[PDB]
Short mmCIF file of C-alpha atoms in Angstrom, two decimals:
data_model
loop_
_atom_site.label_atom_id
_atom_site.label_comp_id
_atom_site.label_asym_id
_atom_site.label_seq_id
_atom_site.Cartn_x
_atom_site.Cartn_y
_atom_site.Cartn_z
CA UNK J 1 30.82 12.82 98.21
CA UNK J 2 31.05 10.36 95.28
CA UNK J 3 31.21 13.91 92.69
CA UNK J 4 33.87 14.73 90.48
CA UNK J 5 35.83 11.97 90.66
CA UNK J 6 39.11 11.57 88.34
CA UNK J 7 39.09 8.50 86.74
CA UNK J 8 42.71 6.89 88.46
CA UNK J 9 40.48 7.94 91.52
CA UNK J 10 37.94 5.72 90.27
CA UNK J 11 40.25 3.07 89.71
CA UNK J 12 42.02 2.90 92.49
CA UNK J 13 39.39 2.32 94.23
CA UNK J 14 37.71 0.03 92.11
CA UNK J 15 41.18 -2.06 92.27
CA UNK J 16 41.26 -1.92 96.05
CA UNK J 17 40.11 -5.23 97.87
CA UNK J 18 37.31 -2.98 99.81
CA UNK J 19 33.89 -3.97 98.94
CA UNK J 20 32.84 -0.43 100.50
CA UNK J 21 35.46 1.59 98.81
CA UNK J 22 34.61 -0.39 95.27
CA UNK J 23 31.32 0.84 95.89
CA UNK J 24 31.88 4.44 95.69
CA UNK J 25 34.25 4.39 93.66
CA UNK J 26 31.55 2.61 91.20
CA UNK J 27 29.10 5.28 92.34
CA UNK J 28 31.71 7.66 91.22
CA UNK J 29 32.06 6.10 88.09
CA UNK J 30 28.21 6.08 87.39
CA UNK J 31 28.05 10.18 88.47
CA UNK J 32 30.51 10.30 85.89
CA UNK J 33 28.67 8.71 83.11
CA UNK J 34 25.58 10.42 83.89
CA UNK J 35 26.59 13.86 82.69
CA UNK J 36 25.49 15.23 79.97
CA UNK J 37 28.12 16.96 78.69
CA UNK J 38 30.83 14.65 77.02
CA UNK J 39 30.97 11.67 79.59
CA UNK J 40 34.16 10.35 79.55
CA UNK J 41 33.06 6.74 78.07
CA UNK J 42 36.32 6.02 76.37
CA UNK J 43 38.49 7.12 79.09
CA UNK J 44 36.58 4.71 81.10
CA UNK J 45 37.16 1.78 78.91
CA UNK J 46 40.52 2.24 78.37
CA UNK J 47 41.03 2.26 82.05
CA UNK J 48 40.00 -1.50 82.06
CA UNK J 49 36.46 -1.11 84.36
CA UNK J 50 34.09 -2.88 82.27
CA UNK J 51 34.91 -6.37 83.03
CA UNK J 52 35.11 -4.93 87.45
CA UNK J 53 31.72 -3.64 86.44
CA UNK J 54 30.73 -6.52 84.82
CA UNK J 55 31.43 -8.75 87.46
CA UNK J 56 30.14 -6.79 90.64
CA UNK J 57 26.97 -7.51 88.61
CA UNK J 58 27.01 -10.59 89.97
CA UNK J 59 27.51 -10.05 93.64
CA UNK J 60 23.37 -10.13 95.16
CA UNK J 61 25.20 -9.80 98.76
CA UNK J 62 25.86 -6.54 97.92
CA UNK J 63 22.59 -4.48 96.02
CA UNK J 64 23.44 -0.87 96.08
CA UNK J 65 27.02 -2.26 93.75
CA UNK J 66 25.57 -4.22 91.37
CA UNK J 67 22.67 -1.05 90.92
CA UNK J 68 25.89 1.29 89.94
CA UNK J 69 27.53 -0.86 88.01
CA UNK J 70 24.31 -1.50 85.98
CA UNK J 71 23.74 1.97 85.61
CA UNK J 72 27.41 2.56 84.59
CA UNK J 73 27.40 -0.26 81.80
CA UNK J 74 23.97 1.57 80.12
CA UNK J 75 25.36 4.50 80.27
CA UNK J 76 28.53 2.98 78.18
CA UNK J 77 26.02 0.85 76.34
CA UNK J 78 24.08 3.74 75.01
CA UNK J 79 27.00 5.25 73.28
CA UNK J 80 28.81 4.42 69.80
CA UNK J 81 28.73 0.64 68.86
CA UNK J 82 32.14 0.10 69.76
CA UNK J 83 31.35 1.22 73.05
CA UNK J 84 28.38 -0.74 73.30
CA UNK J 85 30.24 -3.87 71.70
CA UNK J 86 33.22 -2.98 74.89
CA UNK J 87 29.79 -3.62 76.97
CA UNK J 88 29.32 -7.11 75.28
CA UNK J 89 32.58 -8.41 75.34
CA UNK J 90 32.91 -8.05 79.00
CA UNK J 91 30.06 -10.90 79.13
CA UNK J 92 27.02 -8.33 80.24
CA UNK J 93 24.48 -10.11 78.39
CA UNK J 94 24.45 -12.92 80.74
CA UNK J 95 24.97 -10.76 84.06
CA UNK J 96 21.98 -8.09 83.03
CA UNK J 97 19.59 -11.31 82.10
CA UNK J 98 20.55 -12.48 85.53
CA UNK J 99 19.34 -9.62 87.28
CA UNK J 100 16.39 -9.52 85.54
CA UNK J 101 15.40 -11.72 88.26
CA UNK J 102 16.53 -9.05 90.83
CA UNK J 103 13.98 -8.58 93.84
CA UNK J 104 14.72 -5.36 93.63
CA UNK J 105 12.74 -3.46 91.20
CA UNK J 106 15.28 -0.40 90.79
CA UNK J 107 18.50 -3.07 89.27
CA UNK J 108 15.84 -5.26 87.22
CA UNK J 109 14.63 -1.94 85.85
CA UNK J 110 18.33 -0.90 85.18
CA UNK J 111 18.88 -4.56 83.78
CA UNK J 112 16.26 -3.61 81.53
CA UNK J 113 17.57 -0.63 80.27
CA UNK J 114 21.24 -1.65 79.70
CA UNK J 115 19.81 -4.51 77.50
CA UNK J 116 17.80 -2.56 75.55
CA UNK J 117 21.00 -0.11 74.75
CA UNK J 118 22.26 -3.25 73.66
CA UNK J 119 19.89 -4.72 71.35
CA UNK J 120 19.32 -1.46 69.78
CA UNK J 121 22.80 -1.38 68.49
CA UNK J 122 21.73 -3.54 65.80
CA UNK J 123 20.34 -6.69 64.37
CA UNK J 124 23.87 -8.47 65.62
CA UNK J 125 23.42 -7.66 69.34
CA UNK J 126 19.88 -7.87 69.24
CA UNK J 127 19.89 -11.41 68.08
CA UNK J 128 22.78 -12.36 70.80
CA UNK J 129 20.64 -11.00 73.44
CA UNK J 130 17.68 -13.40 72.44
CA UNK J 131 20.10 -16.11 72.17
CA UNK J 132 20.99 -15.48 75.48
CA UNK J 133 17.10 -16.04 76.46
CA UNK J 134 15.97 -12.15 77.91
CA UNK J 135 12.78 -12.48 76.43
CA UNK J 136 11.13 -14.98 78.92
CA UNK J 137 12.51 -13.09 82.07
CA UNK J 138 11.16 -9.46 80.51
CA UNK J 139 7.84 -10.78 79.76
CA UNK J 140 7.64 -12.35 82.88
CA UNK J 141 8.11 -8.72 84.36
CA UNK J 142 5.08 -7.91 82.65
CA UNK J 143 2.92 -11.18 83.77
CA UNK J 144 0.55 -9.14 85.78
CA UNK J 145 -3.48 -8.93 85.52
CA UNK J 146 -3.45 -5.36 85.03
CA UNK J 147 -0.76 -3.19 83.81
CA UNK J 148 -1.56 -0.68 85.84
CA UNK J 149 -0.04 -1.37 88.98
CA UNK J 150 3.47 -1.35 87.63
CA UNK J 151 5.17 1.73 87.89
CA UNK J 152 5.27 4.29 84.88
CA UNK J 153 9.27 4.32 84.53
CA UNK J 154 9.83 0.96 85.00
CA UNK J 155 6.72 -0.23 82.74
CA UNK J 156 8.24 2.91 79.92
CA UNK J 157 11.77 0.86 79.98
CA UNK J 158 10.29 -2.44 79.63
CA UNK J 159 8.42 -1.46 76.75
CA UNK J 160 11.30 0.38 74.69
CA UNK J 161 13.37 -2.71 75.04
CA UNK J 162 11.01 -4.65 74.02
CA UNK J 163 10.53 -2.54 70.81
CA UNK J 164 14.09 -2.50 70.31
CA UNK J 165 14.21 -6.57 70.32
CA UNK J 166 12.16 -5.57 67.30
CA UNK J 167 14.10 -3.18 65.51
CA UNK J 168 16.34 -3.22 62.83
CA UNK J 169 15.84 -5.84 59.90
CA UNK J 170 18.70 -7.61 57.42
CA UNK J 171 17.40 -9.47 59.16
CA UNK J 172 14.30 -8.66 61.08
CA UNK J 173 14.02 -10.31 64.15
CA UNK J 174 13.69 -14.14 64.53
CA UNK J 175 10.11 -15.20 64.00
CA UNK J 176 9.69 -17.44 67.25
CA UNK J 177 10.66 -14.34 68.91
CA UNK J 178 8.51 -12.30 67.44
CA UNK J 179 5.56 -15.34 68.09
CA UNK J 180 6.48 -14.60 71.64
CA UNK J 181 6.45 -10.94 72.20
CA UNK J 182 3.55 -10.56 70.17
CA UNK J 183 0.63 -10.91 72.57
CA UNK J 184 2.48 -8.52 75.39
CA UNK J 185 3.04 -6.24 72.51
CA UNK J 186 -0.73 -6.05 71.93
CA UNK J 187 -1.53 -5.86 75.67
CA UNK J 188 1.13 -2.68 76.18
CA UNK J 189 -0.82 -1.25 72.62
CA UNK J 190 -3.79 -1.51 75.31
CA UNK J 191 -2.32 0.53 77.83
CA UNK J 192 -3.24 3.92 78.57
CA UNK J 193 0.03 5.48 79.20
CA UNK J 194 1.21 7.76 75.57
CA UNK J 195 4.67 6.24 75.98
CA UNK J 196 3.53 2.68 76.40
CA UNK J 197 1.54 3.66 73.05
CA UNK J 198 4.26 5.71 71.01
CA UNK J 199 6.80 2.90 71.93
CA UNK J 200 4.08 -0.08 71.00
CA UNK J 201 3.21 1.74 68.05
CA UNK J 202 6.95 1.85 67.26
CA UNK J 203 7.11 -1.66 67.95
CA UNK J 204 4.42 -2.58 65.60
CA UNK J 205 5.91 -0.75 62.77
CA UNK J 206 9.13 -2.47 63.20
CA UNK J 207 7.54 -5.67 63.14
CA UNK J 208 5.17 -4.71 59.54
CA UNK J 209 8.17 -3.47 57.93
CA UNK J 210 8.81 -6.26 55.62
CA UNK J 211 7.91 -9.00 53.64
CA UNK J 212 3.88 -9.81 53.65
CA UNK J 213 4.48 -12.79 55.85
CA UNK J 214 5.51 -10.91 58.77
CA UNK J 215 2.50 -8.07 58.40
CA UNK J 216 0.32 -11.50 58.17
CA UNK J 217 2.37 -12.40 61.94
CA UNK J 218 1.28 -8.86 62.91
CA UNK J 219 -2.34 -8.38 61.50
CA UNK J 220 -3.89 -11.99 62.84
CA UNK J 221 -3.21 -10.66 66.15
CA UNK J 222 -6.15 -8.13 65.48
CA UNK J 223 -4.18 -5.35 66.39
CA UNK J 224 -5.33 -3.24 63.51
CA UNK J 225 -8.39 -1.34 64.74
CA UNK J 226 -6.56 -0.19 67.43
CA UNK J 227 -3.79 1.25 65.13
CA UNK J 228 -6.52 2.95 63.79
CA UNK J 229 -7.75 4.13 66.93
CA UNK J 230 -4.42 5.41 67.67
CA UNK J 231 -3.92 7.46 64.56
CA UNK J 232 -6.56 9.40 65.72
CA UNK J 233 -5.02 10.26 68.61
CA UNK J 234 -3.81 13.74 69.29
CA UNK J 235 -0.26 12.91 70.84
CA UNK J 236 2.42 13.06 67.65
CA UNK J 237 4.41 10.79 69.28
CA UNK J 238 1.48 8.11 69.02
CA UNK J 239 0.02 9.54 65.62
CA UNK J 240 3.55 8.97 64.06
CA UNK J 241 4.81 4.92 64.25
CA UNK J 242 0.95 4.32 63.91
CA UNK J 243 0.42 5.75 60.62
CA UNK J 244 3.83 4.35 59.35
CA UNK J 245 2.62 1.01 60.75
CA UNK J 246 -0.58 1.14 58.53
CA UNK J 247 1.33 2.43 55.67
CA UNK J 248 3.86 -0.88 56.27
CA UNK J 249 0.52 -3.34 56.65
CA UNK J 250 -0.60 -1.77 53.05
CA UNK J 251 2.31 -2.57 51.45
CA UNK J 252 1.38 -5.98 51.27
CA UNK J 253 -1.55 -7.69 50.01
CA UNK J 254 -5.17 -6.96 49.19
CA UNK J 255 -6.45 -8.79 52.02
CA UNK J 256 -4.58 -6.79 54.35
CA UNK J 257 -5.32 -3.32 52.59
CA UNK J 258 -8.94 -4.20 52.91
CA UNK J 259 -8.20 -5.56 56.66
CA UNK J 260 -6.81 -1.82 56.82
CA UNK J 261 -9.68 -0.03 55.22
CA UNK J 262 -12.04 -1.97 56.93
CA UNK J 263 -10.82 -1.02 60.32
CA UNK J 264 -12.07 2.96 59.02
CA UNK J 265 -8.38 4.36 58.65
CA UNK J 266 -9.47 6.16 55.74
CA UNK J 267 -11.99 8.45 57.74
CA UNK J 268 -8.64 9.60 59.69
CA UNK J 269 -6.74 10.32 56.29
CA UNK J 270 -8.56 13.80 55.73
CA UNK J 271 -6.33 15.60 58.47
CA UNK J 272 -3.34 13.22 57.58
CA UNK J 273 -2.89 14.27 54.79
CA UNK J 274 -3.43 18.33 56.05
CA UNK J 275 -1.73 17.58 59.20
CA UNK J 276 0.56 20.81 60.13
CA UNK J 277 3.78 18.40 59.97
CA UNK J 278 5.66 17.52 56.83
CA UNK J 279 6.39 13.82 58.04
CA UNK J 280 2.94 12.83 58.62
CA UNK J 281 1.65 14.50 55.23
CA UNK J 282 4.37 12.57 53.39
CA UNK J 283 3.94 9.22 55.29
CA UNK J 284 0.05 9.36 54.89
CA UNK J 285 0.13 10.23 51.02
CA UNK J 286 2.62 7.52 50.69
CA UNK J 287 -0.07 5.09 52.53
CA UNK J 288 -2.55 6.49 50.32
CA UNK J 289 -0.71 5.67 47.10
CA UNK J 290 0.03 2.25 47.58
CA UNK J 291 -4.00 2.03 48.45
CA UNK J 292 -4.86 3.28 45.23
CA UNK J 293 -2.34 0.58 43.86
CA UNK J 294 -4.83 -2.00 44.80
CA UNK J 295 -8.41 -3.03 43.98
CA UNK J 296 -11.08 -1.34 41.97
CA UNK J 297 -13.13 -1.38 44.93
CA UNK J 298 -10.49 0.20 46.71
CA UNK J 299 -9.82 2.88 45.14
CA UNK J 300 -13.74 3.36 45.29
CA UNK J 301 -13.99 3.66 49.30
CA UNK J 302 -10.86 5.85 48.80
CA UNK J 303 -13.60 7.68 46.01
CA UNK J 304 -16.50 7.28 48.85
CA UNK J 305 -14.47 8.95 51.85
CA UNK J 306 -14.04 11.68 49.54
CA UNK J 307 -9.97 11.49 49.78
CA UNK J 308 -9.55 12.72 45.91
CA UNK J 309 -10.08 16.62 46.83
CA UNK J 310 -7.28 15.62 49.50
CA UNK J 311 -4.97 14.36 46.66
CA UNK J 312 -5.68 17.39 44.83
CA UNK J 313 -5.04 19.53 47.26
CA UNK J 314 -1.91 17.46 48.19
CA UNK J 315 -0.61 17.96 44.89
CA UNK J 316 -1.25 21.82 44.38
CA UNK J 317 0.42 22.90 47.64
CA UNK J 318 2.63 20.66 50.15
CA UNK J 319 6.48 20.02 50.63
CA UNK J 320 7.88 18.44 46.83
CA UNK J 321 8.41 14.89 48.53
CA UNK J 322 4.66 14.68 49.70
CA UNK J 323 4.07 15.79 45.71
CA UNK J 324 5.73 13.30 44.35
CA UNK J 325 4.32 10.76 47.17
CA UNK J 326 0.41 12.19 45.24
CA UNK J 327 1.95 12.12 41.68
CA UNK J 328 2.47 8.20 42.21
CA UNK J 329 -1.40 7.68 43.86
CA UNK J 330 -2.23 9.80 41.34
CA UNK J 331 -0.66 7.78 38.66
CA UNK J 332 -1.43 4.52 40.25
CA UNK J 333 -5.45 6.07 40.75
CA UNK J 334 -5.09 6.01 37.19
CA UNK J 335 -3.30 2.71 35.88
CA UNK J 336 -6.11 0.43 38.47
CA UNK J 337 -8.96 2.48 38.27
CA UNK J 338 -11.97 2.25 35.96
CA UNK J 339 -13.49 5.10 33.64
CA UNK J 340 -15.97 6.53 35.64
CA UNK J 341 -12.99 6.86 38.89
CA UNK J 342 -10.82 8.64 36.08
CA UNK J 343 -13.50 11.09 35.21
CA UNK J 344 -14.40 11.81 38.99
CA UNK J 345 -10.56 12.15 39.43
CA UNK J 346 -10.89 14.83 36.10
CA UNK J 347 -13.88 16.54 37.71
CA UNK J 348 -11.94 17.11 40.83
CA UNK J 349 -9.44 19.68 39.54
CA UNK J 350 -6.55 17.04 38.99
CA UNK J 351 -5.36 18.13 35.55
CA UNK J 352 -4.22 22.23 36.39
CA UNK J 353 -2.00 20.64 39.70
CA UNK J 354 -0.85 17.82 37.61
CA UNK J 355 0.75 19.83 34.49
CA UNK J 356 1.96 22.48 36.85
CA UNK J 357 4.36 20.10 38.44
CA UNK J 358 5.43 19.10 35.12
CA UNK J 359 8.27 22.03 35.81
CA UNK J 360 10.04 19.83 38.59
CA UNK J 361 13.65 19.61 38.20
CA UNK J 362 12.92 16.07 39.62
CA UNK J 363 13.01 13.67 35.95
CA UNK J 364 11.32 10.63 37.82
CA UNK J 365 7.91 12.65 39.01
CA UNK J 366 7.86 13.85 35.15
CA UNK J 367 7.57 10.22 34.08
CA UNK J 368 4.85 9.71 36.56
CA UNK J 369 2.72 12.29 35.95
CA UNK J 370 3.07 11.87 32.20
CA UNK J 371 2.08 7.95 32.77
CA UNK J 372 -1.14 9.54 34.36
CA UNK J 373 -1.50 11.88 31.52
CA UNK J 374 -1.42 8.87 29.30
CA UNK J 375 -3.78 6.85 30.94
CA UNK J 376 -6.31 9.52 31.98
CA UNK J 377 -6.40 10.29 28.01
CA UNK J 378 -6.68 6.20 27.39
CA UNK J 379 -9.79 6.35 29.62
CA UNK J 380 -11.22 9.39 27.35
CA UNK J 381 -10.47 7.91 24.26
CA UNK J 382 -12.78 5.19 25.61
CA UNK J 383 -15.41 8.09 26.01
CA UNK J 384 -14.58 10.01 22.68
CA UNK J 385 -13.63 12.80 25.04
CA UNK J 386 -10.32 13.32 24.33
CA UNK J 387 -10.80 16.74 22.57
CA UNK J 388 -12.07 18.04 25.59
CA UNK J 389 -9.15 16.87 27.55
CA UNK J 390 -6.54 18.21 25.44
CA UNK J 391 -8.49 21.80 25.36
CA UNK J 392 -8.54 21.84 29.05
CA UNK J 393 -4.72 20.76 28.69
CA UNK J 394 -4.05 23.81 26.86
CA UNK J 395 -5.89 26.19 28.84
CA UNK J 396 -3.72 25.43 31.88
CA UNK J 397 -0.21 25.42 30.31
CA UNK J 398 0.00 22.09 29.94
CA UNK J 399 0.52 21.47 26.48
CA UNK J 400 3.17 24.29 26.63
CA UNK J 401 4.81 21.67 29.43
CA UNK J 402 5.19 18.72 27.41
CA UNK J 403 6.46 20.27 24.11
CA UNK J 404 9.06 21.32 26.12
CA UNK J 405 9.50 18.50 27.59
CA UNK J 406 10.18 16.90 24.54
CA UNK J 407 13.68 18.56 24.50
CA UNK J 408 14.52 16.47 27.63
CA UNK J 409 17.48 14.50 28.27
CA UNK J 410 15.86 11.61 29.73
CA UNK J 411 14.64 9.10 27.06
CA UNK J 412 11.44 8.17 28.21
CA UNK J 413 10.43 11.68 28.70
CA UNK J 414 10.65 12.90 25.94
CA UNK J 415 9.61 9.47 23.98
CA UNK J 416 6.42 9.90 25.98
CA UNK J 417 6.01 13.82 26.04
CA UNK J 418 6.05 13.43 22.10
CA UNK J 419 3.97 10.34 21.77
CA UNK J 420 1.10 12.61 23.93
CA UNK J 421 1.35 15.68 21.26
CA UNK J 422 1.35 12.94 18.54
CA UNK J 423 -1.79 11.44 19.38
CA UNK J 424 -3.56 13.98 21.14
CA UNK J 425 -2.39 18.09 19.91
CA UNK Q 1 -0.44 -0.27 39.81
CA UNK Q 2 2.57 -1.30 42.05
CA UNK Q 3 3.47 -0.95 45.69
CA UNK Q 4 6.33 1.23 46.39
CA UNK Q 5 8.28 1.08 49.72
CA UNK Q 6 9.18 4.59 51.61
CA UNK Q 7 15.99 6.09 70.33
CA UNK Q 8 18.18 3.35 69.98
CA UNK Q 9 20.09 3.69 72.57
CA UNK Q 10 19.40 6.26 76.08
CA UNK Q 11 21.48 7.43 78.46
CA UNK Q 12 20.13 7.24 82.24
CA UNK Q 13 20.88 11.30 83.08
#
């Protein structure tokens, strides 16, 4: 009936003074839209319907409109940001917080939606739409004893949006907002649903990428056990923004490592960093490099969960970025740790790994592994072993490695590289 | 020892 349309179909009868025939015509328009192959969003604009769209919003007399032309404006909203900023400048932002209020679940769902294409455009839009005061009416939506009883869709949509009010960053969100959502954030990271989770999770790790004040905001809510929790799950989707969520809340202080290692992430780290996908290898060898960046005692539960055969094993076979990601926990293993860690990490098979990715075209993992070079040796010196450690050096190649090195054009490397067969061969 | 650092938008179909 309403298939096919053209769009001077469309608006003529959008343009005609029949509420009934601006209906279908608006149901045409939405068929339209909803097609996945090249939806004709900018012929749609140009014809001049966002602001008719836009305004039959408003009309509650008539339902089944205002649920078209909602559905019509995400679909242009979820497009290009010039698209989405047509959507804006017809004065949506106002009409979709509105209908938040809709008794009818299906257009405050849809309400929901087209403001969440909206606010993921970017920091600018998102930041308008919180001026414009959505987040009271969509956390009211979710004011109910138990989650449950919502419907799956409608509670999904609710809690993308959400995590898209707190996306982006230069700059990150505004922090009364993020005060606000918070607690519904922790309650949906609660829910038993894997999108609820994967989108809470994503949420989360939009919110503890950044400065250590916001990852304070994030961790006094308590919410990292569960993030733990959750990175043992078995849905990728979940496992994913969790583990880059820990690795954000480790990029901050001490205190919030340890809150991190106390919550028993590191028990989960021995399939991170084997886990079958390149991402999740990468992202957890990252996380485990800025942990051995931190305390002594640190890097000793890291010791105690026996993670260092991990490292090694990181290091002698995975995709070069996840090499590079062990090269710098390697490095850093070495520059905080004490004598006895160093000498575990020797006793581990570290060194044959180590010089054999001293042929990486890549100049800045040559400086870090030859920092760790240097400092394991500083920590034998202090043990009159250093004879030893150049022999075993030599028997892998690795001596071979840094005199050539020495030819380098980088002036560090070589500065270093020749300082090590100065002192040590 | 230093610290390192490292849909928006759907359709209705």
């Amino acid at each position: 009936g309403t298939v096919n349309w053209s769009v001077e179909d469309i608006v003529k009868g959008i343009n005609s003074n029949n509420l009934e025939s601006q209906l279908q015509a608006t149901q045409a328009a939405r068929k339209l839209l909803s097609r996945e192959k090249q939806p004709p969003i900018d012929n749609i604009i140009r014809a001049g319907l966002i602001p008719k769209f836009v305004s039959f919003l408003g009309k509650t007399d008539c339902s089944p409109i205002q649920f078209e032309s909602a559905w019509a404006l995400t679909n242009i909203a979820s497009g290009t940001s010039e698209q989405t900023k047509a959507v804006v400048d017809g004065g949506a932002i106002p009409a979709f917080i509105s209908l938040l209020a809709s008794p009818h679940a299906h257009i405050s769902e849809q309400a929901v939606w087209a403001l969440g294409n909206i606010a993921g455009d970017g920091s600018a839009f998102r930041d308008l739409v919180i001026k414009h005061g959505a987040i009271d009416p969509l956390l009211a939506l979710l004011a109910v004893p138990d989650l449950s009883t919502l419907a799956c869709g409608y509670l999904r949509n609710l809690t993308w949006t959400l995590s898209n009010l707190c996306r982006n960053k230069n700059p990150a969100p505004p922090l009364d907002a993020v005060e606000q959502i918070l607690p519904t954030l922790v309650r949906l990271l609660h829910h038993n649903d894997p999108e609820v989770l994967a989108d809470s999770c994503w949420a989360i790790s939009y919110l503890t990428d950044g400065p250590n004040e916001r990852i304070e905001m994030v961790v006094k809510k308590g919410v990292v056990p569960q993030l733990v929790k959750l990175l043992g799950a078995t849905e990728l989707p979940i496992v994913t923004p969790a583990l880059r969520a820990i690795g954000n809340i480790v990029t901050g202080t001490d205190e919030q490592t340890q809150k991190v290692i106390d919550a028993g992430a590191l028990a989960v780290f021995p399939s991170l960093l084997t886990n079958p996908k390149t991402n999740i290898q990468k992202e957890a060898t990252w996380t485990m490099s800025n942990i051995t960046a931190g305390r002594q005692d640190q890097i000793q539960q890291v010791v105690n969960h026996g993670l260092v055969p991990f490292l090694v094993g990181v290091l002698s076979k995975a995709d070069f970025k996840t090499q590079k990601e062990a090269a710098w926990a390697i490095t850093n293993y070495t520059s905080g740790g004490t004598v006895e860690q160093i000498v575990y990490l020797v006793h581990c098979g570290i060194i044959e790994p180590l010089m054999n990715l001293l042929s990486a075209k890549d100049t800045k993992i040559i400086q870090v592994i030859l920092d760790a070079i240097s400092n394991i040796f500083q920590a034998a010196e202090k043990l009159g072993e250093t004879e030893k450690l150049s022999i075993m050096i030599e028997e892998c190649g690795g001596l071979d490695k840094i005199e050539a090195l020495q030819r380098h054009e980088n002036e560090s490397v070589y500065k270093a590289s020749l300082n090590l067969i100065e002192k040590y061969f | 020892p230093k610290k390192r650092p490292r849909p928006p938008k759907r359709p209705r179909n």
